[PDB]
Amino acid sequence: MREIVHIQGGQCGNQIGAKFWEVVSDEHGIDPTGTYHGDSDLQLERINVYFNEATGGRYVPRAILMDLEPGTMDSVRSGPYGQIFRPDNFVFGQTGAGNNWAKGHYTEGAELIDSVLDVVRKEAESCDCLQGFQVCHSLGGGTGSGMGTLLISKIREEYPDRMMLTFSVVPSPKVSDTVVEPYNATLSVHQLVENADECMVLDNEALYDICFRTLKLTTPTFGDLNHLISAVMSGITCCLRFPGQLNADLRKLAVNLIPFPRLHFFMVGFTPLTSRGSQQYRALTVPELTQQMWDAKNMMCAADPRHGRYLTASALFRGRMSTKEVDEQMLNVQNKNSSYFVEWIPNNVKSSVCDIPPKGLKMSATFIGNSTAIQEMFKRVSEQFTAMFRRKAFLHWYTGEGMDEMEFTEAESNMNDLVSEYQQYQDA
Amino acid sequence: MREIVHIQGGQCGNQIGAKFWEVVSDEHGIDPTGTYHGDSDLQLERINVYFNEATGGRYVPRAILMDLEPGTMDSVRSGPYGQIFRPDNFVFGQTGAGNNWAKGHYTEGAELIDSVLDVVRKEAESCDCLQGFQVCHSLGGGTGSGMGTLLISKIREEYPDRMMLTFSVVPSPKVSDTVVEPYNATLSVHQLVENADECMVLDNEALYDICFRTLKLTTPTFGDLNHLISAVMSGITCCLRFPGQLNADLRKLAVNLIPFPRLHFFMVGFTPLTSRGSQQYRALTVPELTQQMWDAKNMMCAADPRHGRYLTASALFRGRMSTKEVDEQMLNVQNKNSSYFVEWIPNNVKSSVCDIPPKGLKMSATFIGNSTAIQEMFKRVSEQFTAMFRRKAFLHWYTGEGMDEMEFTEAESNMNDLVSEYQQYQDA
Amino acid sequence: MREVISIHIGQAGIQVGNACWELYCLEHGIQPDGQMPDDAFNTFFSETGAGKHVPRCIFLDLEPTVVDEVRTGTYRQLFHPEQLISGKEDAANNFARGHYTIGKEIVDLALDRIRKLADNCTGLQGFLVFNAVGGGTGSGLGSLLLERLSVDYGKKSKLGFTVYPSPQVSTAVVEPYNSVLSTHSLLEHTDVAVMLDNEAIYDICRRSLDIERPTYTNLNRLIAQVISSLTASLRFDGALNVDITEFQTNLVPYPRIHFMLSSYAPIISAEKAYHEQLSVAEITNAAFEPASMMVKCDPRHGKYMACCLMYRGDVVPKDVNASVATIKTKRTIQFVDWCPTGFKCGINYQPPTVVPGGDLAKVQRAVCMISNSTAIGEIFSRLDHKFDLMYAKRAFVHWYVGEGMEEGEFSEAREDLAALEKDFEEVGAES
Amino acid sequence: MREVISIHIGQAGIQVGNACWELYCLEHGIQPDGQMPDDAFNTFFSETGAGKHVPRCIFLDLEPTVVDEVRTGTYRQLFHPEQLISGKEDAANNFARGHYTIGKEIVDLALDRIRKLADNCTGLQGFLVFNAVGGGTGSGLGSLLLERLSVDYGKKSKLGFTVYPSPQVSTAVVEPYNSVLSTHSLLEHTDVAVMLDNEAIYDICRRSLDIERPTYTNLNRLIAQVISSLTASLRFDGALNVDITEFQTNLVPYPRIHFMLSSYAPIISAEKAYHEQLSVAEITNAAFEPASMMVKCDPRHGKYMACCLMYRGDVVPKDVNASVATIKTKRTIQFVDWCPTGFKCGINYQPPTVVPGGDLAKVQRAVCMISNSTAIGEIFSRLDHKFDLMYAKRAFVHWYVGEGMEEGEFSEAREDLAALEKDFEEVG
Amino acid sequence: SRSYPGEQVEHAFNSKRLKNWEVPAVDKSQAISTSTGTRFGTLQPRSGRTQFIVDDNGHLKSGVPKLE
Ligand SMILES: Nc1nc2c(ncn2[C@@H]2O[C@H](COP(=O)(O)OP(=O)(O)OP(=O)(O)O)[C@@H](O)[C@H]2O)c(=O)[nH]1
Ligand SMILES: Nc1nc2c(ncn2[C@@H]2O[C@H](COP(=O)(O)OP(=O)(O)OP(=O)(O)O)[C@@H](O)[C@H]2O)c(=O)[nH]1
Ligand SMILES: Nc1nc2c(ncn2[C@@H]2O[C@H](COP(=O)(O)OP(=O)(O)O)[C@@H](O)[C@H]2O)c(=O)[nH]1
Ligand SMILES: Nc1nc2c(ncn2[C@@H]2O[C@H](COP(=O)(O)OP(=O)(O)O)[C@@H](O)[C@H]2O)c(=O)[nH]1
Ligand SMILES: [Mg+2]
Ligand SMILES: [Mg+2]
């Protein structure tokens, strides 16, 4: 029951999809051959939320890899855990991506959708009770920003009642992985505002600082960044996969977070994060978990909470612990820095808990929060978009695909409506 | 009891029949020496539906191989399973056919009927209870199409109560193996509208699709495609040959299928089909059989059922299974995507089951669909006919055999009326 | 049961028959002395009481100087000497001599020999006629033979492979007359005609085989390869067998249009073979390439009306289909509108054979493409313009009028050729 | 699968073709005799049915004196003999002869080679054009060849690594003429055109490599290092994989501005490697150094409209984003306002390879920079001065108008430079 | 010659997947009257009496509007 299908579309999508399925596989004790080698029956009780049984007792992930130019797919197949995916669940086109939203959404998306959806349906029927969909996007690139939104639109029409979730990697404030990032951003955010129910924004800048200062790493590879992201993605469905003295389904998480249908851009963080030196010094207690999680540094996106107001927040704990302490810590926080919280919400946090920690750990905690400091990213993005669009740089590339300019102005107005909505409820 | 006499006309028919009798014979554990070497007593009970006893315990098939230019028979007469046939069931003419429907129907065919009919009768009376006929065709050439139909009209009048099937392979839409193909097609269709009870249509092109899109083959040969056609042909007479908790005779399969006497064109598909790598992941259950068969890819004909509506359908499952799942599955489909099924037929599927799966499997199925998308074969053929018949191209070859001209238009009008019957009943 | 009869008229007829038969004996293991150390040789041969395989061909000519080379060569134990037919005097590059004066004395024995040769046949498929238009013997005597054959058999199928008078490279001066005369004579009687030109095959030998000095024998090797590919499906197994009647029916649209081009691929040297891969897509693209046409016609000045392809060796039907679909999608290939179809494909499992001391390279895939395009209007226009330029002055006409003709035969032939080129124009025009 | 087509025109094109194709044969262990003692060589080769790897390049030229050397050099077993195209006589430093007289009867002969060279590619990225602007074959045949490509392919990506007439060092007197005529001909037909001068690479050989006896075989070895560093993502794994389609999109603001600069770092002798450490920050600093530019243009006189970076070797992504941030803090570097972004980046885990007998040093970090600066209007202007200088007396023109050109093509080609000159200022 | 839509098998029959990057010839598919006007639409029906416009030997017999 409560099955979940997983989508990764793009280079960044497909690469973090590798780490995510490696983290989950180690959680439930399955080898890259697909066989099971865990000990408890807890690994086998709710394996069906992500995997499908096979002959001889194998568990294949319920994932889809969609990406043009299968180069990165050939890599993840050559990876250690590339033997687990069904070769059927690969969708690729021989053409190039272009780092372009248009041809991702209009030309080559158009021919891949025929096969992507048939793959989606044939595995969504295997579910006895579909909970929702989750995707891994990257708003800079062309495939992710173009195929992903086209896929989400189709998904929302074919399954509107369910929950589609997004871990979108947004552009970075100072460094820019590509040059047409603003155009790729707005044209995707304009699609996200109508067709998304939950969308956590991540930024590589925030990931770099956490990996540099806190984790004290010296050569943070994208393998490590995705080990971070894979950790925080797994930390959401712990209530689904494992028992808990206060469990929290995915649906009730949104119900408590988003007060309005359009404010679904969250902000995440994981705890605990220590160096190899400080693992000896600092303890593992709930006050420790909550002190690091509320910090303005664990925010995996480059938004500053001290500038905005928290609409809602959420915490998910893992490890046999005392549920009075968590309720006390979250209340204590609200009373202390009360100005950062809205007043017409009495108690604006939810708190889950799971009796099952990560594999090698004993206490962990994961954070989600819907702040009004998220509007800053959209202001910075909207500013860069209008600066380039006022002169029509790189525009012949988009209009060469049957796009017009109303599709840009519509996108920019819809992003301007969103940033004003966030400004209203930010009463400073 | 329930005997069946089998015809193979033309080069194509003489080569599909090669694999067919290789498949069925192995299913009953008989050698190319014709001697039985199976194990169970189940093979011996209904062996007489296809074979006849002979001195020394040999079992010769109840087949008839007819063809002009017996060159292709010299192949099968020399193959591994070429020593089973009776040599008197080898009818051939010293001259050639020429991919010309006329002389394959009027001049040369007529000089062979006097001999062919003595062959069909002498082994239609050896049947204590004749069930029906079955033929294998090719609407492109002259022998299979021309002599095929001319043989039928002789059979239709001699044995009007018995049943006549035609596994006719029809032309391909995008690449034509012959140039005179549209002429030979309609002039044969004009015979099958009136002188046929059931007519399964197949396309060599859609067979290629299934061959490397599902089977993911590398070097498909006609020897492998015939290993597909022979799999569905063998999939029909299971209820005649093997016991089952819900049997389905060949006659009852038609009455449940064609509502009106003219719509006797179907489309077939086989299940399960996996690669050599996929059998490691995918499981073999009824929900798998029921989605791969209902998909719009296993349709061995080049007609997309999603461009039309299903009038009726069928399914012949094989293997000890739960007869509820089959009942509720075929029910669930008609309810989910109700747009593709007609309304004035509430329950438009028939479901049989046999306790004896294929020789090497544990569960299997077979599908027969009577959709209104079958008209697409007739639109595409109608234009290719009129584009060259209005110009009178390649036609002096047909009047060379004294053929008339209205025999072309009547053959065409008969089609362009059949293409409308398939549309009245398609209220979209 | 699958038997054909071969006729080599004129000099070039037997010049290419020698190559074809050195090919066939080697391909079927037949030693030059008739016998070898079923149903595989029966297409071209006949077995005597013990071991001897005599070929079912006829070599007809009027110069003893070549039939005697054949009689003295190593291939002298093969033929029944009554098959090798020669005359005392030659036609001397004169249609009138070949048709009215000389050939009418030996037609009687040629026909009774053809009768005796077709008697032993059980199932006769058709007559192959290797002719060389441009020389009196070839032209006139083939016209006379074809008229006699049409009145005798009629129902049988006549393929004629006619070495056609070439645009510029020409070893004659009167040939624009006898080419028109031969066409006007045989048009009503041949069932299909395959054109091929010494200049085009010279260019092929230059650009592909890297040979720079071909002495009329490399061209014959190439023609032998072509016929072997074309008649494989008669004596070799393989999917999609194709015989003569199937070949001609779906290829000749109107009673007039029965002349067609030819091509072959791959055709390479023993090192470019070893340094190339030759997939089926490359083979079909090279076949449909104009620079591979065995005749001096450019298909891009017209529109195809049908094509026939005979793949040999390691070929699969899906690959054939995909390559034909790619050709269709291509933009430089045109097709006259009234044929939405247009390809008759066949496969054979027997790869093309190679000859000792030859020049081609051992391959495993090969294609012999044969198409009927509306561009041979250009070669008919060339020939008619040359006949015109000459007959405007009554040049050389005294020879033809002395050797038993009159003037009206020139006007009949010229009007027939004008009508033929108007046909090739109209039947291609679209509404 | 990720395939390209490399074209070499003129003597320079072939003189670099020996350099690059000596590099790849070395970079994939390919012996000069074709074979070696997948998906790696398949970018530049075609594994025949047995052993040998044929390069997918084409050496086109008119003088036989260079292509015959390749036919006798050690790299003679490599090339398919029909790919190496050579004529009788050459264009003789004259744009007309390469465009109207001689070029017109060999293009289709090259096209048939390119035609059959594009079909064996299953996934094509784009054509690579090596040109020699300033001569007859390079400037004449090249421009005529591109137009024949633009009508045959149209949308495909054609790059141009066109060596360009140096300001001071010059081995021609008419090279101002056939350069102008080249641009106006390639301007509307190339997708993006890199520039590089023989003098700018001479000083690189003087300062850094410290070779005082430099020859062309010392320059062509520097160009192969660029492309090997540019097409690593096509054939080698590594984070931030980047293909060619995504290369022109975020780099060419307007359909006109596609003249770009190049760089490389490090460039050191064998011994100073034992005097350095080559940190990634130091590399990208020296990559933006004008002294490390491969064109004699000065970026510190203009502004940057875009930048593209290809890193290689031991590089991790945090430092690329760390050091680029620093360069954006420096003030010597400017950026036009309407592109706040501008840094497409790329990584590869395959360090650059060293050639036996070469002059570079074994290293583990490297950067290949490509930028679209507006200062490229300076090197453009001089060509418009020297052309206008000689054209006032119409010296040397009786040669151009002697080989099928008229006065139109001179003023026609002269105005476009004026139109392009103002275009390089309208962006400011 | 035309290319009629093979509906379920219409994918994998573009020029691209057939290794042809040469600006595909689409008029062979556009002369047809398919529903959506593209490769994936189904075509239309006819009455099917099919007059002649031509005598035995080609040569459009009447004043049929023809392109010279
Ligand atoms: N491909 C090929 N063509 C040949 C060969 N020998 C001659 N030809 C051509 O055939 C034409 C002449 O035909 P011939 O057979 O020699 O003349 P003829 O038909 O015997 O008439 P007469 O000479 O009067 O007896 C010339 O155009 C030759 O180029 C050959 O060996 N191979
Ligand atoms: N980087 C580099 N440039 C070269 C080389 N050889 C020549 N060049 C330059 O290329 C330009 C002319 O080279 P060519 O290829 O001979 O010119 P072309 O197109 O062949 O014209 P023609 O000589 O008339 O046939 C000059 O500016 C040369 O300095 C080389 O080996 N490497
Ligand atoms: N966590 C993580 N993010 C990446 C990685 N690679 C790329 N990204 C981001 O992916 C963004 C560009 O999208 P990309 O997937 O590379 O191109 P696309 O194929 O058009 O979607 C860039 O902003 C990169 O920062 C990676 O390896 N790990
Ligand atoms: N499945 C299958 N189809 C074939 C085979 N051979 C031919 N066909 C089809 O049969 C058609 C030609 O008809 P053909 O049998 O040669 O002419 P006939 O002798 O008059 O019946 C073509 O469309 C072929 O594609 C085969 O071996 N297997
Ligand atoms: Mg002669
Ligand atoms: Mg030069």
Numbering used by the authors:
A (entry chain I), B (entry chain O): 1 to 428
C (entry chain k): 1 to 37, 46 to 439
D (entry chain M): 1 to 37, 46 to 436
E (entry chain H): 2 to 69
Paper lines:
The inner junction (IJ), which bridges the inner gap between the B-tubule and A-tubule is formed by non-tubulin proteins. PACRG and FAP20 are arranged in an alternating pattern to form the IJ linking the PF A1 of A-tubule and PF B10 of the B-tubule.
Using focused refinement, the IJ complex of Chlamydomonas was improved to 3.6 Å resolution. At 3.6 Å resolution, we were able to segment, trace and de novo model PACRG, FAP20 and FAP52 in Chlamydomonas. Thus, the IJ complex is made up of two copies of PACRG and FAP20, one copy of FAP52 and FAP276 and one copy of Tether density 1 and 2 per 16 nm. FAP20 has a beta jelly roll architecture, which consists of mainly β-sheets with a small α-helix. FAP20 is sandwiched by the tubulin dimer from PF B10 and the α-tubulin from PF A1. FAP52 consists of eight WD40 repeats forming two seven-bladed beta-propellers. In this work, we show that the acetylated K40 loop binds to FAP52 and forms a fully structured loop. FAP276 itself forms different contacts with tubulin with both of its N- and C-termini, thus it provides strong anchorage for FAP52 to the tubulin lattice.
